[PDB]
Structure 1
């Protein structure tokens, strides 16, 4: 692991995580990138050094630290042309932020176009020295982090039509249905009688995964950074960018057990050991499991998740019982995804810079139709009624957690004790996923589908939260101040 203070080099490397070699964009020269760690209350100083030379995956870059509120450091959030201009090749940029009030399981990824699909993604764990759940497990370290990733044989910018993941990678390793069958599988090591905090991280660009481990079950204790009441489950559907801590008791006979991550698209199932990794008990033979996937009798359902500590729902217990309601219309037309009829396209001047430079009138913010101002200090309700093609769409809000007052597949809202998280499945026809939060964080924040192909195709809006408090809230460093000057000076071939 690295952090809280570290350089992170962004490099090109040809890799073959399923036996198929291709160019990639990697943090620290590995897929996934290095695990970043720190403690609650740390000042993260993450010096991102852009060493990229391959124009086919972009030489520029920008990194988002997924799930962190970035209060007072909106400039460090990552989204290109919302919060910064990209870092240019041969340059560095220091992401300098604090995490005073968060601890849990997070991740990081490129937030420039579809570049994270080309490899720039990794896990990020913030430990809590007084974690209320600490006595529920024995082992919690780099070896208990499990990343689930989609992998494409075609470069992101060379995809024609609808992207379909070729291979599921667990901790960077996996077999392709038409690939070498001797391609290495990831191994998760346990010892009989010990309990493990499995930090399950979706670093997916698109598919959701149904995660299970043969003959084992879990207690979920954390959801997207938020401590939960322990919830006993035996399978976990995890959407793009979601995280869970799932405590596993190594209470089965010493042996090898299949770890399964079944995608919703591409090649499904487990023939030849695809979509699989290995849980190996100390003392077991070094071999593939022979175990059977038994029926999930207690699958995770989002409405069953409850915050560990009381987190009252903002507003009153009825639809629209808040200061500000936006019933967002999620659609698709003219070859692009739309929110309230508008497809997001990045502006030349980052939204934050527009505001800081003096553009504080809602009507003047660019891109026109894709920026919604929110007043500061107010309760907000968003609905995200589903049905639009390409689903199920997992929506993500930057700068915030939110209460999921109505989940996909849930008819009646819960205004008492719904889970709080940062990525939510919006479901399908008939669903009307509803989320609430309070505007306590001045700055422009993305709301978008975390299927990265859909973001690129316009499925996003920017919430310009507390526009007239944004300058005061977010003093910017000299290196941020110069990013657009450097980037705009680049030749087209060096972007």
Structure 2
């Protein structure tokens, strides 16, 4: 009686996709505008004048077709659909410098992809810091669920926020050893703001419950530099999926959610009819936010007082310091799959933060190098011009996975007391290990029996007082030819160099590749760069360094 009739929660979505014959077609203008999301006016870049951008909605098995037209004047654009597998469809992944040139003002790009997973994610620009000026929106793919509920509330975005744009902050961030500071936050694009005169402008997010009913909230952390704990005073939360992977449901009183990650939760309306605070609390070990305790929304029961703030108390779950994921034991995919890593290629990418040049600028290095690649010469252009290319520069940050279905096991490690959300394109990886301190190849234990599986996980780090450092280990099979970004999801870090490209099954790129799709946009882009100085990529060390993204 569903659009995926004949399939269900135990279907292996990596191997089988419902045939729906339906195409969901969107049209996205990327616009240069202003908004007062917490009652203070500021410039924003948005999809169709909205924040968050409109939700892309589809059923499992549909095809989605998104026309993106750049209506801005001084940025290119490219849209990435986060967590979408893009199996044999790498050129639709929307990564400038990898899969395409950026789309210039007054040009378009049509993304087409298959909904070959179900649950919750998001699309966002993958061009420089653009996603965090506002170019992002939900993806909501209907499908089976590991628990029942009554109403689907759709996306719930969590964002940090300042009244200066991230682009305005960037030069300061490049030149500083300290992490960036933000003034406030938004819950699905809303908050109040308290002015210097103690006026309240703006409006808080608010949602309304009927007593007894069960609600699905699809949380997404779209922040630039904040790891949050999300909670609802007095209400427990049943987690039912992490990223695009349904899991064995479990109940908790808060959700720790890093950048790029999603969790689906079911909240039952089982408390006294009242107003309760919804809280999105930046974790202070890796977030610096002036208003940690005032990024709140309002859960309003029918039967509660109207026009009246909650007086509920926060769940006493501990402190709001460390930046942590749910544990490996907590996240058990419903579809059980083992990490078959015998014969895997082993790699390690170290993470460091290093000064460069005379200023200096502080860049993040992954695998030994700050990524330094070219918007106008994308990796797929390089491999089209030279199919057997082997001369990768250190600055291209390459990791090869040349053999079909061979596993890679990648350890991402740091000595620094700084945790990072790692995102891999083109794949759900198997999260084998996450931990603190030094990585111990003799001692570490790798979880291979139905490990958590998802597309974004933290490289956790110890605090300075505990010696700093940490690591995560993922595995994935080479099941998807393409050039796939793996990088830190913090927009400032990635732009500063924290990224590597997986060159997967290079001899099979002609399986998906289209020179016309690449060159049309590349020619448009060069035409724009000839007339507009924002068309040239700044890659030197005395201005706003762009890794290529």
TM-score (norm 1): 0.91
Is 1:447 equivalent to 2:486 in the alignment? yes
**Separation (CA, whole Å) in 2 of partners of 1:301 and 1:73:** 31
Alignment of structure 1 residues 63-462 onto 2, 5 Å: 63-99=79-115, 101-128=116-143, 131-133=144-146, 136-140=148-152, 143-159=153-169, 160-161=172-173, 162-176=179-193, 178=195, 180-264=199-283, 265-267=287-289, 274-286=294-306, 287-296=308-317, 301-303=326-328, 304-316=330-342, 322-333=343-354, 334=356, 335-347=362-374, 348-363=376-391, 365=392, 368-376=395-403, 377-388=405-416, 391-408=418-435, 412-428=445-461, 429-462=468-501
Deviations 1:298-347 (A, max 9, x none): 9972311101121111214xxxxx42011111112222111222111222
Consecutive unaligned residues of structure 2, counting only runs of 5 or more, are 1-22, 174-178, 357-361, 438-443, 462-467, 536-549
The residue matched to 2:281 in structure 1 has which SS? strand
**Separation (CA, whole Å) in 2 of partners of 1:385 and 1:71:** 28
The residue matched to 2:523 in structure 1 has which SS? helix
Q: Is contact 2:157-2:187 (8 Å) kept?
A: yes
152-161 or 215-224, larger mean C-alpha shift: 152-161
Q: 2:523 aligns with which of 467, 485, 493?
A: 485
229-238 or 334-343, larger mean C-alpha shift: 334-343
**Separation (CA, whole Å) in 2 of partners of 1:64 and 1:362:** 27
Partner of 1:319: none
For the aligned residue pairs, the C-alpha RMSD in angstroms reads 2.1
Aligned residues: 473
Cα 1:170/1:120, change in 2 over 3 Å: same
**Separation (CA, whole Å) in 2 of partners of 1:252 and 1:228:** 26
**Separation (CA, whole Å) in 2 of partners of 1:111 and 1:137:** 34
Q: Is contact 1:163-1:453 (8 Å) kept?
A: no
The residue matched to 1:35 in structure 2 has which SS? strand
**Separation (CA, whole Å) in 2 of partners of 1:243 and 1:493:** 37
463-472 or 441-450, larger mean C-alpha shift: 463-472
Deviation of the 1:48 alpha carbon: 0.6
Deviation of the 1:285 alpha carbon: 2.0
**Separation (CA, whole Å) in 1 of partners of 2:337 and 2:109:** 36
Alignment of structure 1 residues 29-40 onto 2, 5 Å: 29-40=49-60
Partner of 1:464: 503
Deviations 1:128-184 (A, max 9, x none): 1xx143x511112xx342110122322222212253222210010113465652420
Is 1:11 equivalent to 2:21 in the alignment? no
Deviation of the 1:280 alpha carbon: 1.2
Consecutive unaligned residues of structure 1, counting only runs of 5 or more, are 317-321
The residue matched to 1:432 in structure 2 has which SS? strand
**Separation (CA, whole Å) in 1 of partners of 2:291 and 2:133:** 24
Cα 1:479/1:412, change in 2 over 3 Å: closer
Deviations 1:177-231 (A, max 9, x none): 6565242000022211011111111111221101100000111110001010001
Deviation of the 1:494 alpha carbon: 5.5
Cα 1:360/1:176, change in 2 over 3 Å: farther
The residue matched to 1:486 in structure 2 has which SS? helix
Q: Is contact 1:261-1:275 (8 Å) kept?
A: yes
Deviation of the 1:409 alpha carbon: 5.0
Cα 1:68/1:462, change in 2 over 3 Å: same
Deviations 1:328-380 (A, max 9, x none): 111122221112221112223101121123243232x4574512221232011
Q: Is contact 2:183-2:291 (8 Å) kept?
A: no
**Separation (CA, whole Å) in 2 of partners of 1:269 and 1:48:** 35
Cα 1:52/1:367, change in 2 over 3 Å: farther
21-30 or 348-357, larger mean C-alpha shift: 348-357
The residue matched to 1:362 in structure 2 has which SS? coil
Q: Is contact 2:207-2:298 (8 Å) kept?
A: yes
**Separation (CA, whole Å) in 2 of partners of 1:311 and 1:177:** 49
TM-score (norm 2): 0.82
Q: Is contact 1:234-1:297 (8 Å) kept?
A: no
Deviation of the 1:290 alpha carbon: 0.8
**Separation (CA, whole Å) in 1 of partners of 2:69 and 2:394:** 29
Cα 1:218/1:88, change in 2 over 3 Å: same
Q: Is contact 1:268-1:275 (8 Å) kept?
A: no
Misfit runs of 4+, over 6 Å = 297-300
238-247 or 412-421, larger mean C-alpha shift: 412-421
Partner of 2:9: none
The residue matched to 2:91 in structure 1 has which SS? helix
